[PDB]
Design a protein around this ligand. Structure first.
Ligand code: HEC
Length: 104
């Protein structure tokens, strides 16, 4: 687990739909600049994953672990066809980077 390492993980995994370092602009993926502590459905000009929002799920560490293990199996609405996770180790390093920016 590291900080300068996870930075390349998210920046090389979900840095296309979730740009947490662009400019508060969220075109395809929801601006993950503060997903930690914020529930789904928040941006005004963005129909965030309406499903997740209704499920009443709070985006957190372990909570995001499940939704990420399967976004289509967990929330039947997301439009992100993310690939299934195959290395929980790298996932832990992911939350680490987002924890320094959106949780530190
Ligand atoms: C486009 C190719 C995406 C990639 C790659 C990833 N995500 Fe995504 N995500 C995407 C969209 C379009 C949306 C909005 C839902 C919809 O209806 O389209 C999302 C949403 C999420 C959320 C929910 C946040 C919220 O709505 O409040 C999470 C927690 C999320 N995405 C996580 C996530 C992670 C961890 C990714 C890399 C492992 C990832 N996404 C990639 C589009 C795309």
């Amino acid at each position: 687990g590291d900080v300068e390492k996870g930075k390349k993980i998210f920046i090389m995994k979900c840095s296309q739909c979730h740009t947490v370092e662009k400019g508060g602009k969220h075109k395809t993926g929801p601006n993950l600049h503060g997903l930690f502590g914020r529930k789904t459905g928040q941006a005004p000009g963005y129909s965030y994953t309406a499903a997740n929002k209704n499920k009443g799920i709070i985006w957190g560490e372990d909570t995001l672990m499940e939704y990420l293990e399967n976004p289509k199996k967990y929330i039947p609405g997301t439009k992100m066809i993310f690939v299934g996770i195959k290395k929980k180790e790298e996932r832990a390093d992911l939350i680490a980077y987002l924890k320094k920016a959106t949780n530190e």
